[PDB]
């Protein structure tokens, strides 16, 4: 239940399917990572609480808690947790997804699929969204996907 960034694993062997964020007793990840399945955490079980396919987000144990947003000017850090590698910080200036409903920050970083759900951080260390839903331009560009608190 401790705050932090976590691998999302599945089982023969184990494989990492994604990443998520524990904050304020709630686990946050991308819908496409778990498809809303229950998660084991040690001997405990985490059940889905809120989810939305269009936003590609899901929270467990309570409502979505992450609410910081990119300021539109500053560099950010992807706290990437790739399969088989220690958590690592990658700093970048986001580009922008321009949509009919407004602009969304986007990071032009291409990490293995099991990194989906990794948090993107502002300079204060607040999570401004999750990595792993995006588009191809052949480089992948991820939206900075944030939910609503």
């Amino acid at each position: 239940t401790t705050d932090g960034v976590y691998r999302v694993m599945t089982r023969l062997g184990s494989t990492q399917v994604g990443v998520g964020v524990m904050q304020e007793g709630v686990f946050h990840t991308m819908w496409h990572v778990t498809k809303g399945a229950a998660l084991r955490s040690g001997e405990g079980r985490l059940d889905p609480y809120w989810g939305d396919v269009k936003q590609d987000l899901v929270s467990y144990c309570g409502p979505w808690k992450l609410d910081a947003a990119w300021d539109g000017l500053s560099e950010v850090q992807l706290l990437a947790v790739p399969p088989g590698e220690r958590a690592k910080n990658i700093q970048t200036l986001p580009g922008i997804f321009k949509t009919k409903d407004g602009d969304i920050g986007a990071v032009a970083l291409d990490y293995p699929a099991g990194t989906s759900g990794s948090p993107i951080l502002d300079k204060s260390g607040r999570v401004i969204g999750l990595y792993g839903n995006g588009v191809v331009i052949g480089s992948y560009v991820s939206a900075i996907t944030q939910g609503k608190r």
Binding site: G4, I96, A108
Partner: protein, 40 residues
């Protein structure tokens, strides 16, 4: 198939992070299935 979580770190900014990547400005659409696509 059981899915489980393992802690991998604190959520912290790192002063010494590797820096990389571009900042493209892209016109995109978001459909009902959560899929982004390019628009022209």
């Amino acid at each position: 198939v059981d899915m489980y979580i393992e802690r991998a770190g604190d959520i912290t900014w790192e002063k010494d992070a590797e820096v990389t990547g571009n900042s493209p400005r892209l016109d995109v659409a978001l459909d009902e299935s959560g899929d982004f696509s390019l628009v022209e």
